[PDB]
Amino acid sequence: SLKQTVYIASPESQQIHVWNLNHEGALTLTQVVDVPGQVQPMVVSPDKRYLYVGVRPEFRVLAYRIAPDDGALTFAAESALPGSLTHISTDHQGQFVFVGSYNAGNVSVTRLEDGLPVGVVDVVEGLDGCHSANISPDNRTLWVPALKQDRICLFTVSDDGHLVAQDPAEVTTVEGAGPRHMVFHPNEQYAYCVNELNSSVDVWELKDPHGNIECVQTLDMMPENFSDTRWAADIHITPDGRHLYACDRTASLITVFSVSEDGSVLSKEGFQPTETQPRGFNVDHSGKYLIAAGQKSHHISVYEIVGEQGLLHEKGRYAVGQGPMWVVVNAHE
Numbered sequence: 001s002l003k004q005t006v007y008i009a010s011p012e013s014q015q016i017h018v019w020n021l022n023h024e025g026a027l028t029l030t031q032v033v034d035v036p037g038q039v040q041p042m043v044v045s046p047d048k049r050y051l052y053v054g055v056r057p058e059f060r061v062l063a064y065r066i067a068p069d070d071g072a073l074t075f076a077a078e079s080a081l082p083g084s085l086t087h088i089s090t091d092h093q094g095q096f097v098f099v100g101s102y103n104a105g106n107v108s109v110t111r112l113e114d115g116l117p118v119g120v121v122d123v124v125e126g127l128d129g130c131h132s133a134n135i136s137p138d139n140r141t142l143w144v145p146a147l148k149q150d151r152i153c154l155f156t157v158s159d160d161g162h163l164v165a166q167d168p169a170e171v172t173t174v175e176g177a178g179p180r181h182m183v184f185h186p187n188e189q190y191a192y193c194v195n196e197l198n199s200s201v202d203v204w205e206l207k208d209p210h211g212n213i214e215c216v217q218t219l220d221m222m223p224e225n226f227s228d229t230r231w232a233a234d235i236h237i238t239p240d241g242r243h244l245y246a247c248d249r250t251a252s253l254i255t256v257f258s259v260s261e262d263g264s265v266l267s268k269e270g271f272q273p274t275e276t277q278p279r280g281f282n283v284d285h286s287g288k289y290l291i292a293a294g295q296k297s298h299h300i301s302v303y304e305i306v307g308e309q310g311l312l313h314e315k316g317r318y319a320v321g322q323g324p325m326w327v328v329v330n331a332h333e
Helices: none
Strands: 003-010 015-021 027-034 042-044 050-055 060-066 073-080 087-090 096-101 106-113 116-124 141-146 151-157 163-172 179-184 190-195 200-205 214-220 232-237 243-248 253-259 266-273 281-283 289-293 299-306 311-319 326-332
Touching: 003 289, 027 311, 042 087, 042 326, 050 087, 060 116, 073 116, 096 141, 106 151, 116 163, 141 163, 141 179, 151 179, 179 232, 190 232, 214 266, 232 281, 243 281, 253 311, 266 311, 281 326, 289 326
Parallel strands: none
Antiparallel strands: 003 015, 003 326, 015 027, 042 050, 050 060, 060 073, 087 096, 096 106, 106 116, 141 151, 151 163, 179 190, 190 200, 200 214, 232 243, 243 253, 253 266, 281 289, 289 299, 299 311
């Protein structure tokens, strides 16, 4: 039967909370990890053997072995990075770990040898405010949002992990939009990017009728009457590709979007008040539950995704560490 583990990063208290998620959406605390640093971004390896996380003030990628039974974590390795690890991810084969650094303004590739990080293979500078690195469905193109430059850079990922700027070298957003995080639709035809500075979501078609990457839709994710400081953060889509969510740190809301059948058109369904100042959240592998953290509430809330509209229904509230801001869910048989 399906078993899932929810991981929460709380940098301020340097902790990682490990929860078991049952079919009713209830969580039970499995473990509290004391990380030797302020842990922020996290990602599970494709083979699910490891959890890679980034820490500061000593910039490093930390690899934790994931117990296949209860998902418990144990330190396995560490590898130094040139700058702050704002975002972290891997390619589909689990051969490389990609790291976007906001402060250093770059993206780097770290070689993974049998799941463990052994150093930086390549780095691309000049990407002011790089906020994430996301490999495409075919595992060949890395989409790298540069928040300060209002663009998403595109690089071909060679076999030995080197990044080669494609042409076009990138796609552009609205002036002052601030592209931050993004995800791809399960059908591999579209990508959705959340823009931090103007709290909007862009729908990107990977290859339109003319063979180009085009932004085919742009929506304001905020309530129509909202007119405060826009501070968008995270974005996620359910496994079935029917529901897409995004959060804003100022309004402390999760915007619910419904997705058209082909995935090209988004529709704003409603908003869910959530944990104070939500920087990170995620959905489970069944597409039935949504877990959101409050950077200023030091708690996470679990919601059930209901019906076609996919609106959220609060089920529980749990205490975590200080300043939680990242959530990931690992599923195992």
